Paper text:
A distinguishing feature of the pathogenic NWMs is the ability to enter cells through human transferrin receptor 1 (hTfR1), a ubiquitously expressed protein that is involved in the cellular uptake of iron. Here, we demonstrate that an antibody (ch128.1/IgG1) which binds the apical domain of hTfR1, potently inhibits infection of attenuated and pathogenic NWMs in vitro. The variable region of ch128.1 binds with high affinity (5.7 nM) to the hTfR1 between residues S324 to S368 within the apical domain of the receptor.
All three conformations were nearly identical in their variable regions but differed at the linker with the constant region. The structure included variable region frameworks and all six complementarity-determining regions (CDRs), including the residues in CDR-H1 between heavy chain (H) 26–35, CDR-H2 between H 50–66, CDR-H3 between H 99–107 and of residues in CDR-L1 between light chain (L) 23–33, CDR-L2 between L 49–55 and CDR-L3 between L 87–96. While sTfR1 bound to immobilized MACV GP1-Fc, this interaction was not observed in the presence of the Fab ch128.1/IgG1. Based on this model and evidence for direct competition observed in bio-layer interferometry assays, we conclude that Fab ch128.1/IgG1 sterically hinders binding of the MACV GP1 to the apical domain of hTfR1 and thereby inhibits TfR1-mediated NWM entry into human cells. The TfR1 binding site for ch128.1/IgG1 partially overlaps with certain residues where H-Ft binds, specifically hTfR1 residues E343, K344, and N34814. The crystallographic structure of Fab ch128.1/IgG1 also allows for the rational optimization of its framework and CDRs.
Numbering used by the authors:
A (entry chain H1): 1 to 219
B (entry chain L1): 1 to 211
């Protein structure tokens, strides 16, 4: 299968520069062009431009030509996008998109979330949402995890290392008045299994390398 | 500079219904292209060259259009079609996209299950207390959570967030977090979460006392 793997989330300072990578596999790297697309919550999808890995030739949205240099490394099937002199308007999700030179874009990378801010990163605190009987409504109980006061987005939350999935609700982060983010993950579970089965929520905030696995037990 | 307008910005649709979204260009193009995106995930190519179904796209999808007016139609809407659809043209530099059209599937009214969570002992050592009210699996989206400490109505004291529309049962869920200092948390006793929804005859209230 075609796979485009982008580099992880970034927190970057205003006026600095940064680089996103996109590693392609499952096809001949030189046969297709690599495109880059910006998605922000102020302009939505914008085509930045493309590069031909064979000769390094590029085509630019003139809005981004002096902003986003595009380079390639055939040795490793990797395309790069740089972002120079970053301002807050560059905070967005960036995608790489494969595309045959004459066709439209077909495959997209997973996306790289970039936040431009002078603030330093902060890892979350993970707190349990213990299932009581105020958390039971007819043989089914609700438990979860509260990850709080982190910056910037995003965070990954999984339950039991990816085993628990059905009944899981990971709510979108909310921006607190402190300027930090907070979200909650919850699982609905048969209360038959509370005294026996154990439930671990796995939290990973990569910008601060905060890895916390917390066990939520009732009381 | 080619601007692509999509007429139905947001639109609610019932299951099995036939719905058509439009994409109109500011100037003539030779092929429109369609991309589907679910919140959080990356766009996936849906229809290329105005009418060709991308690999994996179900046969119930189809696209038509000419010169400037183009359209996407699903024959009978399903639950897994609740998503955002973008049209795209690569006819002239710079390549552009549309504003997007979001489709949410209609469902029977459903009342939420309301849970309440006291602050953990781990957070109470931190100096702050967060109570969380959980509204699980309801429809439609409108829901009024309201916090009351000792039957005193709080205001500006909490923040809520809503999940995207599920595609299994297509219900929403809401998490509301009331936050107080450890000082004020021990200054009171009964914390309640009052819920108002279409599927509820009377407002439901979950609560607990400190202890």
């Amino acid at each position: 299968e075609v796979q485009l793997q982008q580099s992880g989330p970034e927190l970057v300072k205003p006026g600095a520069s940064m680089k996103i990578s996109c590693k392609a596999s499952g096809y001949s790297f030189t046969g297709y062009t690599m495109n880059w697309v910006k998605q922000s919550h102020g302009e939505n999808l914008e085509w930045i431009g493309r590069i031909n890995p064979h000769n390094g030739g590029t085509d630019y949205n003139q809005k981004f030509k002096d902003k986003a240099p595009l380079t390639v490394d055939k040795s490793s099937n990797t395309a790069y996008m740089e972002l120079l002199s970053l301002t807050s308007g560059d905070s967005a999700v960036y995608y790489c998109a494969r595309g045959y030179y004459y066709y439209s874009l077909d495959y997209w990378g997973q996306g790289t979330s970039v936040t431009v801010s002078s603030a330093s990163t902060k890892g979350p605190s993970v707190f349990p949402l213990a299932p009581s009987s105020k958390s039971t409504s007819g043989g089914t109980a609700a438990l979860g995890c509260l990850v709080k006061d982190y910056f910037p987005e995003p965070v990954t939350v999984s339950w039991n290392s990816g085993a628990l999935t059905s009944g899981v609700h990971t709510f979108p982060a909310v921006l607190q008045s402190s300027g930090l983010y907070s979200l909650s993950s919850v699982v609905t579970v048969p209360s038959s299994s509370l005294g026996t089965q154990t439930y671990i929520c796995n939290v990973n905030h990569k910008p601060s390398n905060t890895k916390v696995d917390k066990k939520v037990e009732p009381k | 500079q080619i601007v692509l307008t999509q007429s139905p910005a947001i639109m609610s649709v019932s299951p099995g219904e036939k719905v058509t979204m439009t994409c109109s260009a500011s100037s003539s193009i030779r092929y429109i292209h369609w991309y589907q995106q679910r919140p959080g995930t990356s766009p996936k190519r849906w229809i290329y060259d105005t009418s060709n179904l991308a690999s994996g796209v179900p046969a119930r999808f189809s696209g038509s259009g000419s010169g400037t007016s183009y359209s996407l139609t699903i024959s009978s809407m399903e639950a897994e079609d609740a998503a955002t659809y973008y049209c795209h043209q690569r006819n002239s530099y710079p390549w552009t996209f549309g504003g997007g059209t979001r489709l949410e599937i209609r469902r029977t009214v459903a009342a939420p299950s309301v849970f309440i969570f006291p602050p953990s002992d781990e957070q109470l050592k931190s100096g702050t207390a967060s109570v969380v009210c959980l509204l699980n699996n309801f429809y439609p989206r409108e829901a009024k959570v309201q916090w009351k400490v000792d039957n005193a109505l709080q205001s500006g004291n909490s923040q809520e967030s809503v999940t995207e529309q599920d595609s299994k049962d297509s219900t929403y869920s809401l998490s509301s977090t009331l936050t107080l200092s450890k000082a004020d948390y021990e200054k009171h006793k009964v914390y309640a979460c009052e819920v108002t929804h279409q599927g509820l005859s009377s407002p439901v209230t979950k609560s607990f006392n400190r202890e």
